[PDB]
Amino acid sequence: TLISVDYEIFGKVQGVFFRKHTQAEGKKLGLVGWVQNTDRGTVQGQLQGPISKVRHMQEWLETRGSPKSHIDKANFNNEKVILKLDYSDFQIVK
């Protein structure tokens, strides 16, 4: 079963190479989607892939992040089953 879920990560999450590490971890886990800095100092995006792989990523986003990050909170929402992927890679949105 494939799912899509949205995320936003709060904390010391900008200026700590969060997007680069997020993309690398997503790719390692066989996930597609995207990551983007927000105007409110957070990191946001969407993950898509097998449920099991998405859960691994969610733990990473709430627990680990990039080496220099400090994560205050990870909010997940809009989880939904999808019939096929909407993306073919894990992109950093400039």
Residue numbers in the entry: 5 to 98
Sentences from the study reporting this entry:
Here we used a pair of thermophilic/mesophilic acylphosphatases homologues (acylphosphatase from hyperthermophilic archaeon Pyrococcus horikoshii (PhAcP) and human common-type acylphosphatase (HuAcP)) as a model to study how local flexibility of the active site affects the enzymatic activity. Despite remarkable conservation of sequence and structure at the active site, the catalytic activity of the thermophilic PhAcP is significantly poorer as compared with its mesophilic homologue HuAcP at low temperatures. The salt-bridge between the active-site residue Arg-20 and the C-terminal carboxyl group is found only in thermophilic PhAcP but not in mesophilic HuAcP. Taken together, our data suggest that the presence of the salt-bridge between the C-terminal carboxyl group and the active-site arginine residue increases the activation energy that results in a stronger temperature dependency of the enzymatic activity.
Importantly, the activation energy (52.5±2.5 kJmol−1) for HuG99 was analogous to that for PhWT (49.1±1.4 kJmol−1), while the activation energy for HuA99 (29.5±1.9 kJmol−1) and HuWT (37.6±3.1 kJmol−1) was comparable to that for PhG91A (32.1±1.7 kJmol−1). To provide further insights into how the active-site salt-bridge affected the enzymatic activity of acylphosphatases, we calculated and summarized the free energy (ΔG#), enthalpy (ΔH#), and entropy (ΔS#) of activation, as well as the changes of these parameters (ΔΔG#, ΔΔH#, ΔΔS#) upon the removal of the active-site salt-bridge. The values of ΔΔH# and TΔΔS# for HuWT were somewhat lower than those for HuA99.
